[PDB]
JSON list of N, CA and C in Angstrom, two decimals:
[
{"chain": "A", "resi": 1, "resn": "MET", "atom": "N", "xyz": [9.04, 39.21, -166.67]},
{"chain": "A", "resi": 1, "resn": "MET", "atom": "CA", "xyz": [7.58, 38.46, -167.66]},
{"chain": "A", "resi": 1, "resn": "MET", "atom": "C", "xyz": [6.86, 37.77, -166.90]},
{"chain": "A", "resi": 2, "resn": "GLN", "atom": "N", "xyz": [5.61, 37.06, -167.23]},
{"chain": "A", "resi": 2, "resn": "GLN", "atom": "CA", "xyz": [5.11, 36.43, -167.11]},
{"chain": "A", "resi": 2, "resn": "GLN", "atom": "C", "xyz": [5.18, 34.62, -167.53]},
{"chain": "A", "resi": 3, "resn": "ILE", "atom": "N", "xyz": [5.33, 33.74, -166.68]},
{"chain": "A", "resi": 3, "resn": "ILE", "atom": "CA", "xyz": [5.56, 32.06, -167.30]},
{"chain": "A", "resi": 3, "resn": "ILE", "atom": "C", "xyz": [4.82, 31.84, -166.68]},
{"chain": "A", "resi": 4, "resn": "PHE", "atom": "N", "xyz": [4.28, 30.45, -167.09]},
{"chain": "A", "resi": 4, "resn": "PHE", "atom": "CA", "xyz": [3.77, 29.36, -166.11]},
{"chain": "A", "resi": 4, "resn": "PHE", "atom": "C", "xyz": [4.72, 27.80, -166.09]},
{"chain": "A", "resi": 5, "resn": "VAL", "atom": "N", "xyz": [4.35, 27.04, -164.66]},
{"chain": "A", "resi": 5, "resn": "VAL", "atom": "CA", "xyz": [4.54, 26.12, -164.59]},
{"chain": "A", "resi": 5, "resn": "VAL", "atom": "C", "xyz": [3.43, 25.13, -164.51]},
{"chain": "A", "resi": 6, "resn": "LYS", "atom": "N", "xyz": [3.66, 23.83, -165.86]},
{"chain": "A", "resi": 6, "resn": "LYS", "atom": "CA", "xyz": [2.81, 22.78, -165.27]},
{"chain": "A", "resi": 6, "resn": "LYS", "atom": "C", "xyz": [3.45, 22.03, -164.78]},
{"chain": "A", "resi": 7, "resn": "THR", "atom": "N", "xyz": [2.50, 21.04, -164.19]},
{"chain": "A", "resi": 7, "resn": "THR", "atom": "CA", "xyz": [3.67, 20.24, -163.37]},
{"chain": "A", "resi": 7, "resn": "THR", "atom": "C", "xyz": [3.13, 18.66, -164.13]},
{"chain": "A", "resi": 8, "resn": "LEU", "atom": "N", "xyz": [3.60, 17.57, -163.21]},
{"chain": "A", "resi": 8, "resn": "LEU", "atom": "CA", "xyz": [3.53, 16.56, -164.69]},
{"chain": "A", "resi": 8, "resn": "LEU", "atom": "C", "xyz": [2.00, 16.06, -163.96]},
{"chain": "A", "resi": 9, "resn": "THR", "atom": "N", "xyz": [1.51, 16.36, -162.77]},
{"chain": "A", "resi": 9, "resn": "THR", "atom": "CA", "xyz": [0.26, 15.63, -162.54]},
{"chain": "A", "resi": 9, "resn": "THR", "atom": "C", "xyz": [-0.78, 16.67, -162.77]},
{"chain": "A", "resi": 10, "resn": "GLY", "atom": "N", "xyz": [-1.15, 17.32, -164.08]},
{"chain": "A", "resi": 10, "resn": "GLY", "atom": "CA", "xyz": [-1.65, 18.22, -164.81]},
{"chain": "A", "resi": 10, "resn": "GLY", "atom": "C", "xyz": [-2.07, 19.53, -163.52]},
{"chain": "A", "resi": 11, "resn": "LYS", "atom": "N", "xyz": [-1.24, 20.30, -163.50]},
{"chain": "A", "resi": 11, "resn": "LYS", "atom": "CA", "xyz": [-1.87, 20.95, -162.49]},
{"chain": "A", "resi": 11, "resn": "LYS", "atom": "C", "xyz": [-0.91, 22.14, -163.25]},
{"chain": "A", "resi": 12, "resn": "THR", "atom": "N", "xyz": [-1.14, 23.66, -163.47]},
{"chain": "A", "resi": 12, "resn": "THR", "atom": "CA", "xyz": [-0.31, 24.58, -163.63]},
{"chain": "A", "resi": 12, "resn": "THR", "atom": "C", "xyz": [-0.27, 26.35, -162.80]},
{"chain": "A", "resi": 13, "resn": "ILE", "atom": "N", "xyz": [1.21, 26.41, -162.19]},
{"chain": "A", "resi": 13, "resn": "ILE", "atom": "CA", "xyz": [1.16, 27.17, -161.96]},
{"chain": "A", "resi": 13, "resn": "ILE", "atom": "C", "xyz": [1.35, 29.14, -162.09]},
{"chain": "A", "resi": 14, "resn": "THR", "atom": "N", "xyz": [1.43, 29.86, -161.73]},
{"chain": "A", "resi": 14, "resn": "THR", "atom": "CA", "xyz": [1.73, 31.53, -162.56]},
{"chain": "A", "resi": 14, "resn": "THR", "atom": "C", "xyz": [2.89, 31.58, -161.66]},
{"chain": "A", "resi": 15, "resn": "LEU", "atom": "N", "xyz": [4.19, 32.11, -162.65]},
{"chain": "A", "resi": 15, "resn": "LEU", "atom": "CA", "xyz": [5.05, 32.69, -162.14]},
{"chain": "A", "resi": 15, "resn": "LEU", "atom": "C", "xyz": [5.63, 34.02, -162.75]},
{"chain": "A", "resi": 16, "resn": "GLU", "atom": "N", "xyz": [5.81, 35.06, -162.24]},
{"chain": "A", "resi": 16, "resn": "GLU", "atom": "CA", "xyz": [6.92, 35.97, -162.42]},
{"chain": "A", "resi": 16, "resn": "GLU", "atom": "C", "xyz": [8.01, 36.18, -162.39]},
{"chain": "A", "resi": 17, "resn": "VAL", "atom": "N", "xyz": [9.04, 36.22, -163.06]},
{"chain": "A", "resi": 17, "resn": "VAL", "atom": "CA", "xyz": [10.12, 36.08, -163.28]},
{"chain": "A", "resi": 17, "resn": "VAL", "atom": "C", "xyz": [10.84, 36.77, -164.50]},
{"chain": "A", "resi": 18, "resn": "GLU", "atom": "N", "xyz": [12.05, 36.57, -164.34]},
{"chain": "A", "resi": 18, "resn": "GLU", "atom": "CA", "xyz": [12.38, 37.47, -165.68]},
{"chain": "A", "resi": 18, "resn": "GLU", "atom": "C", "xyz": [14.20, 36.72, -165.70]},
{"chain": "A", "resi": 19, "resn": "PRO", "atom": "N", "xyz": [14.27, 36.90, -167.28]},
{"chain": "A", "resi": 19, "resn": "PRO", "atom": "CA", "xyz": [16.14, 36.16, -167.90]},
{"chain": "A", "resi": 19, "resn": "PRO", "atom": "C", "xyz": [17.09, 36.10, -166.77]},
{"chain": "A", "resi": 20, "resn": "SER", "atom": "N", "xyz": [16.81, 37.02, -166.32]},
{"chain": "A", "resi": 20, "resn": "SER", "atom": "CA", "xyz": [18.16, 37.34, -165.74]},
{"chain": "A", "resi": 20, "resn": "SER", "atom": "C", "xyz": [17.81, 36.59, -164.23]},
{"chain": "A", "resi": 21, "resn": "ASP", "atom": "N", "xyz": [16.87, 35.72, -163.59]},
{"chain": "A", "resi": 21, "resn": "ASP", "atom": "CA", "xyz": [16.50, 35.05, -162.53]},
{"chain": "A", "resi": 21, "resn": "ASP", "atom": "C", "xyz": [17.49, 33.35, -163.31]},
{"chain": "A", "resi": 22, "resn": "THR", "atom": "N", "xyz": [17.86, 33.37, -161.79]},
{"chain": "A", "resi": 22, "resn": "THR", "atom": "CA", "xyz": [18.78, 31.47, -162.25]},
{"chain": "A", "resi": 22, "resn": "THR", "atom": "C", "xyz": [17.82, 30.93, -162.21]},
{"chain": "A", "resi": 23, "resn": "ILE", "atom": "N", "xyz": [18.17, 29.59, -162.21]},
{"chain": "A", "resi": 23, "resn": "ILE", "atom": "CA", "xyz": [16.71, 28.35, -162.21]},
{"chain": "A", "resi": 23, "resn": "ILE", "atom": "C", "xyz": [16.60, 28.30, -160.69]},
{"chain": "A", "resi": 24, "resn": "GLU", "atom": "N", "xyz": [17.60, 27.77, -159.87]},
{"chain": "A", "resi": 24, "resn": "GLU", "atom": "CA", "xyz": [17.90, 27.84, -158.18]},
{"chain": "A", "resi": 24, "resn": "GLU", "atom": "C", "xyz": [16.27, 29.64, -157.60]},
{"chain": "A", "resi": 25, "resn": "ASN", "atom": "N", "xyz": [16.48, 30.55, -158.45]},
{"chain": "A", "resi": 25, "resn": "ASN", "atom": "CA", "xyz": [15.43, 31.26, -158.25]},
{"chain": "A", "resi": 25, "resn": "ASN", "atom": "C", "xyz": [13.99, 30.70, -158.58]},
{"chain": "A", "resi": 26, "resn": "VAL", "atom": "N", "xyz": [13.99, 30.85, -159.51]},
{"chain": "A", "resi": 26, "resn": "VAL", "atom": "CA", "xyz": [12.95, 29.92, -159.97]},
{"chain": "A", "resi": 26, "resn": "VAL", "atom": "C", "xyz": [12.24, 29.08, -159.10]},
{"chain": "A", "resi": 27, "resn": "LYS", "atom": "N", "xyz": [13.04, 27.64, -159.28]},
{"chain": "A", "resi": 27, "resn": "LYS", "atom": "CA", "xyz": [12.88, 26.91, -158.24]},
{"chain": "A", "resi": 27, "resn": "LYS", "atom": "C", "xyz": [11.92, 27.35, -156.63]},
{"chain": "A", "resi": 28, "resn": "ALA", "atom": "N", "xyz": [13.46, 28.12, -156.71]},
{"chain": "A", "resi": 28, "resn": "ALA", "atom": "CA", "xyz": [12.57, 29.66, -155.00]},
{"chain": "A", "resi": 28, "resn": "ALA", "atom": "C", "xyz": [11.43, 30.07, -154.51]},
{"chain": "A", "resi": 29, "resn": "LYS", "atom": "N", "xyz": [10.58, 30.42, -155.94]},
{"chain": "A", "resi": 29, "resn": "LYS", "atom": "CA", "xyz": [9.45, 31.19, -156.29]},
{"chain": "A", "resi": 29, "resn": "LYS", "atom": "C", "xyz": [8.39, 30.01, -156.27]},
{"chain": "A", "resi": 30, "resn": "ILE", "atom": "N", "xyz": [8.56, 28.36, -157.28]},
{"chain": "A", "resi": 30, "resn": "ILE", "atom": "CA", "xyz": [8.05, 27.04, -156.97]},
{"chain": "A", "resi": 30, "resn": "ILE", "atom": "C", "xyz": [7.86, 26.57, -155.53]},
{"chain": "A", "resi": 31, "resn": "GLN", "atom": "N", "xyz": [8.88, 27.12, -155.06]},
{"chain": "A", "resi": 31, "resn": "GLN", "atom": "CA", "xyz": [8.53, 26.18, -153.08]},
{"chain": "A", "resi": 31, "resn": "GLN", "atom": "C", "xyz": [7.83, 27.37, -152.14]},
{"chain": "A", "resi": 32, "resn": "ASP", "atom": "N", "xyz": [8.25, 29.22, -152.54]},
{"chain": "A", "resi": 32, "resn": "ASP", "atom": "CA", "xyz": [7.11, 30.15, -151.83]},
{"chain": "A", "resi": 32, "resn": "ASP", "atom": "C", "xyz": [5.85, 29.38, -151.82]},
{"chain": "A", "resi": 33, "resn": "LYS", "atom": "N", "xyz": [5.24, 29.99, -153.34]},
{"chain": "A", "resi": 33, "resn": "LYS", "atom": "CA", "xyz": [3.93, 28.73, -153.58]},
{"chain": "A", "resi": 33, "resn": "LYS", "atom": "C", "xyz": [3.77, 27.57, -153.49]},
{"chain": "A", "resi": 34, "resn": "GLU", "atom": "N", "xyz": [4.94, 26.86, -153.49]},
{"chain": "A", "resi": 34, "resn": "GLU", "atom": "CA", "xyz": [3.60, 25.46, -153.25]},
{"chain": "A", "resi": 34, "resn": "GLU", "atom": "C", "xyz": [4.38, 24.89, -152.58]},
{"chain": "A", "resi": 35, "resn": "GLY", "atom": "N", "xyz": [5.78, 25.63, -151.63]},
{"chain": "A", "resi": 35, "resn": "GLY", "atom": "CA", "xyz": [6.23, 24.69, -150.42]},
{"chain": "A", "resi": 35, "resn": "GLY", "atom": "C", "xyz": [7.09, 23.32, -150.83]},
{"chain": "A", "resi": 36, "resn": "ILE", "atom": "N", "xyz": [7.56, 23.41, -152.10]},
{"chain": "A", "resi": 36, "resn": "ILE", "atom": "CA", "xyz": [7.99, 22.39, -153.24]},
{"chain": "A", "resi": 36, "resn": "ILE", "atom": "C", "xyz": [9.41, 22.80, -152.81]},
{"chain": "A", "resi": 37, "resn": "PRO", "atom": "N", "xyz": [10.03, 21.99, -151.46]},
{"chain": "A", "resi": 37, "resn": "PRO", "atom": "CA", "xyz": [12.24, 22.21, -151.76]},
{"chain": "A", "resi": 37, "resn": "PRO", "atom": "C", "xyz": [12.54, 22.01, -153.42]},
{"chain": "A", "resi": 38, "resn": "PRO", "atom": "N", "xyz": [13.26, 23.29, -154.22]},
{"chain": "A", "resi": 38, "resn": "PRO", "atom": "CA", "xyz": [14.10, 23.42, -154.72]},
{"chain": "A", "resi": 38, "resn": "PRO", "atom": "C", "xyz": [14.80, 21.66, -155.43]},
{"chain": "A", "resi": 39, "resn": "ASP", "atom": "N", "xyz": [15.11, 21.67, -153.78]},
{"chain": "A", "resi": 39, "resn": "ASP", "atom": "CA", "xyz": [15.91, 20.06, -154.35]},
{"chain": "A", "resi": 39, "resn": "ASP", "atom": "C", "xyz": [15.13, 19.22, -154.96]},
{"chain": "A", "resi": 40, "resn": "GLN", "atom": "N", "xyz": [13.98, 19.11, -154.56]},
{"chain": "A", "resi": 40, "resn": "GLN", "atom": "CA", "xyz": [13.24, 17.97, -155.31]},
{"chain": "A", "resi": 40, "resn": "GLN", "atom": "C", "xyz": [12.14, 18.33, -156.47]},
{"chain": "A", "resi": 41, "resn": "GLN", "atom": "N", "xyz": [12.51, 19.39, -157.26]},
{"chain": "A", "resi": 41, "resn": "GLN", "atom": "CA", "xyz": [12.61, 20.42, -158.61]},
{"chain": "A", "resi": 41, "resn": "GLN", "atom": "C", "xyz": [13.14, 19.74, -159.90]},
{"chain": "A", "resi": 42, "resn": "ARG", "atom": "N", "xyz": [12.82, 19.16, -160.90]},
{"chain": "A", "resi": 42, "resn": "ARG", "atom": "CA", "xyz": [13.75, 18.56, -161.89]},
{"chain": "A", "resi": 42, "resn": "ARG", "atom": "C", "xyz": [12.62, 19.87, -162.68]},
{"chain": "A", "resi": 43, "resn": "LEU", "atom": "N", "xyz": [13.29, 20.78, -163.46]},
{"chain": "A", "resi": 43, "resn": "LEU", "atom": "CA", "xyz": [12.17, 21.48, -164.48]},
{"chain": "A", "resi": 43, "resn": "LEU", "atom": "C", "xyz": [12.85, 21.46, -165.89]},
{"chain": "A", "resi": 44, "resn": "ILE", "atom": "N", "xyz": [11.98, 21.60, -167.02]},
{"chain": "A", "resi": 44, "resn": "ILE", "atom": "CA", "xyz": [12.14, 21.03, -168.39]},
{"chain": "A", "resi": 44, "resn": "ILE", "atom": "C", "xyz": [11.34, 21.80, -169.17]},
{"chain": "A", "resi": 45, "resn": "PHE", "atom": "N", "xyz": [11.78, 22.20, -170.20]},
{"chain": "A", "resi": 45, "resn": "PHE", "atom": "CA", "xyz": [11.53, 22.88, -170.79]},
{"chain": "A", "resi": 45, "resn": "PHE", "atom": "C", "xyz": [12.13, 22.60, -172.85]},
{"chain": "A", "resi": 46, "resn": "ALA", "atom": "N", "xyz": [10.88, 22.58, -173.48]},
{"chain": "A", "resi": 46, "resn": "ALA", "atom": "CA", "xyz": [11.10, 21.69, -174.53]},
{"chain": "A", "resi": 46, "resn": "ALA", "atom": "C", "xyz": [12.48, 20.65, -174.65]},
{"chain": "A", "resi": 47, "resn": "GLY", "atom": "N", "xyz": [12.16, 19.70, -173.50]},
{"chain": "A", "resi": 47, "resn": "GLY", "atom": "CA", "xyz": [12.62, 18.49, -173.18]},
{"chain": "A", "resi": 47, "resn": "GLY", "atom": "C", "xyz": [13.97, 18.50, -172.42]},
{"chain": "A", "resi": 48, "resn": "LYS", "atom": "N", "xyz": [14.55, 19.76, -172.58]},
{"chain": "A", "resi": 48, "resn": "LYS", "atom": "CA", "xyz": [15.87, 20.32, -172.12]},
{"chain": "A", "resi": 48, "resn": "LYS", "atom": "C", "xyz": [15.37, 20.35, -171.03]},
{"chain": "A", "resi": 49, "resn": "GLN", "atom": "N", "xyz": [17.07, 20.00, -170.10]},
{"chain": "A", "resi": 49, "resn": "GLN", "atom": "CA", "xyz": [16.27, 20.56, -168.83]},
{"chain": "A", "resi": 49, "resn": "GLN", "atom": "C", "xyz": [17.50, 20.93, -167.77]},
{"chain": "A", "resi": 50, "resn": "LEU", "atom": "N", "xyz": [16.63, 22.17, -166.89]},
{"chain": "A", "resi": 50, "resn": "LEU", "atom": "CA", "xyz": [17.21, 23.80, -166.44]},
{"chain": "A", "resi": 50, "resn": "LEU", "atom": "C", "xyz": [18.56, 23.48, -165.74]},
{"chain": "A", "resi": 51, "resn": "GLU", "atom": "N", "xyz": [19.50, 23.91, -166.03]},
{"chain": "A", "resi": 51, "resn": "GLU", "atom": "CA", "xyz": [20.57, 23.27, -164.82]},
{"chain": "A", "resi": 51, "resn": "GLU", "atom": "C", "xyz": [20.47, 24.17, -163.69]},
{"chain": "A", "resi": 52, "resn": "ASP", "atom": "N", "xyz": [20.62, 23.52, -162.52]},
{"chain": "A", "resi": 52, "resn": "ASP", "atom": "CA", "xyz": [21.38, 25.26, -161.73]},
{"chain": "A", "resi": 52, "resn": "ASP", "atom": "C", "xyz": [22.94, 25.79, -162.05]},
{"chain": "A", "resi": 53, "resn": "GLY", "atom": "N", "xyz": [22.03, 26.54, -161.68]},
{"chain": "A", "resi": 53, "resn": "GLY", "atom": "CA", "xyz": [23.19, 28.34, -161.97]},
{"chain": "A", "resi": 53, "resn": "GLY", "atom": "C", "xyz": [23.22, 29.41, -163.05]},
{"chain": "A", "resi": 54, "resn": "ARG", "atom": "N", "xyz": [22.59, 28.11, -163.90]},
{"chain": "A", "resi": 54, "resn": "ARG", "atom": "CA", "xyz": [22.09, 28.80, -165.35]},
{"chain": "A", "resi": 54, "resn": "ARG", "atom": "C", "xyz": [21.22, 30.06, -165.10]},
{"chain": "A", "resi": 55, "resn": "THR", "atom": "N", "xyz": [20.38, 30.86, -166.36]},
{"chain": "A", "resi": 55, "resn": "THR", "atom": "CA", "xyz": [19.60, 31.28, -166.48]},
{"chain": "A", "resi": 55, "resn": "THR", "atom": "C", "xyz": [18.67, 30.89, -166.86]},
{"chain": "A", "resi": 56, "resn": "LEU", "atom": "N", "xyz": [17.85, 31.84, -166.84]},
{"chain": "A", "resi": 56, "resn": "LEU", "atom": "CA", "xyz": [15.95, 31.27, -167.82]},
{"chain": "A", "resi": 56, "resn": "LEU", "atom": "C", "xyz": [16.51, 31.49, -168.96]},
{"chain": "A", "resi": 57, "resn": "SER", "atom": "N", "xyz": [17.38, 32.94, -169.52]},
{"chain": "A", "resi": 57, "resn": "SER", "atom": "CA", "xyz": [17.63, 33.48, -171.14]},
{"chain": "A", "resi": 57, "resn": "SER", "atom": "C", "xyz": [18.59, 32.37, -171.16]},
{"chain": "A", "resi": 58, "resn": "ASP", "atom": "N", "xyz": [19.14, 32.22, -170.71]},
{"chain": "A", "resi": 58, "resn": "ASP", "atom": "CA", "xyz": [20.40, 30.71, -171.64]},
{"chain": "A", "resi": 58, "resn": "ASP", "atom": "C", "xyz": [19.47, 29.71, -172.08]},
{"chain": "A", "resi": 59, "resn": "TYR", "atom": "N", "xyz": [17.85, 29.81, -172.28]},
{"chain": "A", "resi": 59, "resn": "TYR", "atom": "CA", "xyz": [17.32, 28.95, -172.81]},
{"chain": "A", "resi": 59, "resn": "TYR", "atom": "C", "xyz": [16.57, 30.08, -173.28]},
{"chain": "A", "resi": 60, "resn": "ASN", "atom": "N", "xyz": [15.39, 29.27, -174.62]},
{"chain": "A", "resi": 60, "resn": "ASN", "atom": "CA", "xyz": [14.78, 29.85, -175.32]},
{"chain": "A", "resi": 60, "resn": "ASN", "atom": "C", "xyz": [13.12, 30.05, -174.89]},
{"chain": "A", "resi": 61, "resn": "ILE", "atom": "N", "xyz": [13.13, 30.25, -173.59]},
{"chain": "A", "resi": 61, "resn": "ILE", "atom": "CA", "xyz": [12.10, 30.23, -172.38]},
{"chain": "A", "resi": 61, "resn": "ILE", "atom": "C", "xyz": [11.40, 32.08, -172.77]},
{"chain": "A", "resi": 62, "resn": "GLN", "atom": "N", "xyz": [10.44, 31.88, -173.57]},
{"chain": "A", "resi": 62, "resn": "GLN", "atom": "CA", "xyz": [9.87, 33.29, -173.93]},
{"chain": "A", "resi": 62, "resn": "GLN", "atom": "C", "xyz": [8.58, 34.11, -173.18]},
{"chain": "A", "resi": 63, "resn": "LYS", "atom": "N", "xyz": [8.12, 34.90, -173.42]},
{"chain": "A", "resi": 63, "resn": "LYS", "atom": "CA", "xyz": [6.58, 35.52, -172.18]},
{"chain": "A", "resi": 63, "resn": "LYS", "atom": "C", "xyz": [5.68, 34.29, -172.19]},
{"chain": "A", "resi": 64, "resn": "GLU", "atom": "N", "xyz": [5.32, 34.29, -170.94]},
{"chain": "A", "resi": 64, "resn": "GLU", "atom": "CA", "xyz": [4.26, 33.15, -170.99]},
{"chain": "A", "resi": 64, "resn": "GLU", "atom": "C", "xyz": [4.61, 31.91, -171.25]},
{"chain": "A", "resi": 65, "resn": "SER", "atom": "N", "xyz": [5.37, 31.26, -171.40]},
{"chain": "A", "resi": 65, "resn": "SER", "atom": "CA", "xyz": [6.19, 29.88, -171.42]},
{"chain": "A", "resi": 65, "resn": "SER", "atom": "C", "xyz": [5.62, 29.39, -170.45]},
{"chain": "A", "resi": 66, "resn": "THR", "atom": "N", "xyz": [5.58, 27.70, -170.90]},
{"chain": "A", "resi": 66, "resn": "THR", "atom": "CA", "xyz": [4.81, 26.73, -169.99]},
{"chain": "A", "resi": 66, "resn": "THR", "atom": "C", "xyz": [6.73, 25.43, -169.74]},
{"chain": "A", "resi": 67, "resn": "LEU", "atom": "N", "xyz": [7.03, 26.45, -168.58]},
{"chain": "A", "resi": 67, "resn": "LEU", "atom": "CA", "xyz": [8.22, 24.60, -168.56]},
{"chain": "A", "resi": 67, "resn": "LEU", "atom": "C", "xyz": [7.05, 23.74, -167.47]},
{"chain": "A", "resi": 68, "resn": "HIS", "atom": "N", "xyz": [7.86, 22.80, -167.45]},
{"chain": "A", "resi": 68, "resn": "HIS", "atom": "CA", "xyz": [7.46, 20.86, -166.66]},
{"chain": "A", "resi": 68, "resn": "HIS", "atom": "C", "xyz": [8.10, 20.91, -165.97]},
{"chain": "A", "resi": 69, "resn": "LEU", "atom": "N", "xyz": [7.42, 21.09, -164.03]},
{"chain": "A", "resi": 69, "resn": "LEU", "atom": "CA", "xyz": [8.18, 20.45, -163.09]},
{"chain": "A", "resi": 69, "resn": "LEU", "atom": "C", "xyz": [7.61, 19.05, -163.41]},
{"chain": "A", "resi": 70, "resn": "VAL", "atom": "N", "xyz": [9.01, 18.27, -163.09]},
{"chain": "A", "resi": 70, "resn": "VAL", "atom": "CA", "xyz": [8.97, 16.77, -161.99]},
{"chain": "A", "resi": 70, "resn": "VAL", "atom": "C", "xyz": [9.33, 16.96, -160.89]},
{"chain": "A", "resi": 71, "resn": "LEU", "atom": "N", "xyz": [8.54, 16.85, -160.29]},
{"chain": "A", "resi": 71, "resn": "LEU", "atom": "CA", "xyz": [9.30, 15.93, -158.70]},
{"chain": "A", "resi": 71, "resn": "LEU", "atom": "C", "xyz": [10.04, 14.63, -158.08]},
{"chain": "A", "resi": 72, "resn": "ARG", "atom": "N", "xyz": [10.99, 14.99, -157.49]},
{"chain": "A", "resi": 72, "resn": "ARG", "atom": "CA", "xyz": [12.52, 13.83, -157.51]},
{"chain": "A", "resi": 72, "resn": "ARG", "atom": "C", "xyz": [12.76, 14.47, -155.95]},
{"chain": "A", "resi": 73, "resn": "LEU", "atom": "N", "xyz": [13.47, 13.54, -155.54]},
{"chain": "A", "resi": 73, "resn": "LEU", "atom": "CA", "xyz": [14.86, 12.97, -154.70]},
{"chain": "A", "resi": 73, "resn": "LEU", "atom": "C", "xyz": [15.88, 13.12, -155.93]},
{"chain": "A", "resi": 74, "resn": "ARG", "atom": "N", "xyz": [16.69, 14.39, -154.68]},
{"chain": "A", "resi": 74, "resn": "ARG", "atom": "CA", "xyz": [17.90, 14.35, -155.17]},
{"chain": "A", "resi": 74, "resn": "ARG", "atom": "C", "xyz": [18.71, 13.12, -154.75]},
{"chain": "A", "resi": 75, "resn": "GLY", "atom": "N", "xyz": [19.94, 12.23, -155.60]},
{"chain": "A", "resi": 75, "resn": "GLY", "atom": "CA", "xyz": [21.10, 11.68, -155.27]},
{"chain": "A", "resi": 75, "resn": "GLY", "atom": "C", "xyz": [22.19, 11.88, -154.50]},
{"chain": "A", "resi": 76, "resn": "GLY", "atom": "N", "xyz": [22.81, 12.23, -156.06]},
{"chain": "A", "resi": 76, "resn": "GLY", "atom": "CA", "xyz": [23.88, 13.01, -155.62]},
{"chain": "A", "resi": 76, "resn": "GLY", "atom": "C", "xyz": [24.83, 11.66, -154.67]}
]
């Protein structure tokens, strides 16, 4: 499917994904398209945080939905 990723600075990118894609796959596509490492990416749809290891289907992500991309620095 086609989805969209709106950043926090008012920028939007277009992604090609499938519900079977894990979150690190989506962050990896965002990396290929933008150069932002998946470590510095916090994805949120409808307030819910997209956890690594889960899939897009684990959330109510429909075709041409728009996720929110926050740029962070990991602590751990």
